[PDB]
Amino acid sequence: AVVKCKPTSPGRRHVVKVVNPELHKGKPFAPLLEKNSKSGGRNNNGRITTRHIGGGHKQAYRIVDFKRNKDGIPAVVERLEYDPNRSANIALVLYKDGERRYILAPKGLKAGDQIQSGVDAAIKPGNTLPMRNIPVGSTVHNVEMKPGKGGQLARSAGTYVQIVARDGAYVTLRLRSGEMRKVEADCRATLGEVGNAEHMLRVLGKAGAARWRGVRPTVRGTAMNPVDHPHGGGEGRNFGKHPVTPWGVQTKGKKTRSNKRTDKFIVRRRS
Amino acid sequence: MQVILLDKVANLGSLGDQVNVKAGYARNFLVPQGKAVPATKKNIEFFEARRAELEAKLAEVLAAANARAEKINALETVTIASKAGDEGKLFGSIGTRDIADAVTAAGVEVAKSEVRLPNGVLRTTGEHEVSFQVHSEVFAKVIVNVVAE
Amino acid sequence: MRHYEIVFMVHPDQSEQVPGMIERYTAAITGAEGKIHRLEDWGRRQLAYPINKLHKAHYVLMNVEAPQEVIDELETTFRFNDAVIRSMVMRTKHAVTEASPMVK
Amino acid sequence: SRVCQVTGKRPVTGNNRSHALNATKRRFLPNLHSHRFWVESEKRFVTLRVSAKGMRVIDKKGIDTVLAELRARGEKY
RNA sequence: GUUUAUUAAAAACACAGCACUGUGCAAACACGAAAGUGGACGUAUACGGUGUGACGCCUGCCCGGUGCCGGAAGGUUAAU
Ligand SMILES: [Mg+2]
Ligand SMILES: [Mg+2]
Ligand SMILES: [Mg+2]
Ligand SMILES: [Mg+2]
Ligand SMILES: [Mg+2]
Ligand SMILES: [Mg+2]
Ligand SMILES: [Mg+2]
Ligand SMILES: [Mg+2]
Ligand SMILES: [Mg+2]
Ligand SMILES: [Mg+2]
Ligand SMILES: [Mg+2]
Ligand SMILES: [Mg+2]
Ligand SMILES: [Mg+2]
Ligand SMILES: [Mg+2]
């Protein structure tokens, strides 16, 4: 439910909230939190490695169960919660033996639905079962890449990965970027699309809304000086050269995939 | 790599042969598994004159235990119960340890790396052929039956 | 309740285990106080055209007077049972109990 | 560091003498590889960080010899 | 909002937004002779780069040059 806010002040003129009343308006489950220190984009040498990262609000890492190990114990969903750490909403679930965990929320998962991981699960959104047991053509998310490792594919707000084939030990996955990847069929994969699908509908509206998210201002390269960026300089707005990263490498179209360990798994590249 | 042999190998010859193989095949596979000795003239003395028939004895005390894991293991009534669904539909796959738990219990205490499988997963419930390679010369024709729960 | 006619097409290599399935669908129909009127195995029958890269299948007819909850529950079975190829949950007005023309 | 434990090969320095004979200092790195060697006199594997020349030495002197040379030299393995 | 502490506070930068593009995750990229680290305890609705700069109506033709992308037969071609 998106809400185009009203222009009481310039800066609210274009804010589009995404008001989900189903999210829990309280404190998160404290035994599944830990410290999540910021970095500013600064590695162990102290230098900025990744630019434009800083400030924002303090956050606490919700320990989300991606590996999803509780086989055959049926879980019920206690409530959906907001997660500042990611773009999808998370669901505090409650197993039969009393263990509470967080999972990513599927699309049709509401407060009170049941879920179950394992092999003998039911094929319906929320359940985690190995991809030699999910039918071909279904849409799954939170997909592993190695058996028992942890979900890594389709883990964002409103994404999903289809299972277009199954030939022996591999299944072919149409990824969300359009890329066809062979993953082992023993890799577990939760059914259904991941929940918060209208997350891409939001509009931040004002300059300091991205500052709340740890997104520092991004200076474009043609405004700099010829020592700073390759684009810099000129007596006016001059850009007589090809668009390169500040370290000199081409941007508009140069493919920088240098991994040859995993080219046997990639059936088709994206378009 | 002039290397001496301690057992018959695939495409080069039998015991007591001094074959020139590549260095990777001698170092990584043959020598650590005891199937070769790097042929020093002090080792040709250790082997070819002295232990020509003594190392030939040791290859023949192993074949007596090789034919014995065939003759008593002819029962082929191997019952392994696994959880499954219906008309096939297997919950948990049958590997090579799973076949080497019943034949270990009913037969010889054999390791897991001796089971030979064309399927490897063994999903469909029922009888399945399981060849054995307890040693690289003697084979068996055993069929393991998969039982549901 | 609502009279039905459910005919489905099992893979012919699974023909030896079709009466295993019958004893659970009919159990789920009578498990909801539901009548069954006829149940006629048509055997391995030659296809008119090869679906799923093969030419034969093992047809089963079954007339059913069930509630519509345990029929929608049954439609999800033929979806995720990989042995059955096609299914046809078809609705009829009255409980037809006279046998098929293709039993003779 | 890049030291073959068998032969003691060490990264020496040189020049990139171009076609116009310009000299820029370069390093000749050895062909080191971490490798496991089967020790029949202990029935186990020892992981030596050895150059590709050094594997030729082990296949000529025998592995049970060089591991005695490293004890007498004073380096763990 | 920010900016030349100390002759310039602007029409400059930023900005939300837009688009092209790279990147399947041991990601691309960056800091590092390396281990490693940031990215990110994130997973394409994600991240980096580049351009433009709310909004409204719009964004017309040109692939000859230079770039990048794909084609793999021929031609030429290095060490070996
Ligand atoms: Mg940035
Ligand atoms: Mg921007
Ligand atoms: Mg900018
Ligand atoms: Mg300037
Ligand atoms: Mg420059
Ligand atoms: Mg100008
Ligand atoms: Mg000009
Ligand atoms: Mg000089
Ligand atoms: Mg001033
Ligand atoms: Mg001033
Ligand atoms: Mg501008
Ligand atoms: Mg062109
Ligand atoms: Mg052209
Ligand atoms: Mg080209």
From TrEMBL, chain C:
Residue positions where N6-acetyllysine is found in the record: 93
An example Gene Ontology CC term for this record: cytosolic small ribosomal subunit
Key words, A-Z: Acetylation, Ribonucleoprotein, Ribosomal protein, RNA-binding, rRNA-binding
Gene Ontology biological-process annotations: translation
Transmembrane segments: none
Sample GO molecular function, one term: structural constituent of ribosome
Biological role: Binds together with bS18 to 16S ribosomal RNA.
Family to which this protein belongs: Belongs to the bacterial ribosomal protein bS6 family.
Protein name: Small ribosomal subunit protein bS6
Gene name tied to this protein: rpsF
Parent-protein residues present: 1 to 104 of 133
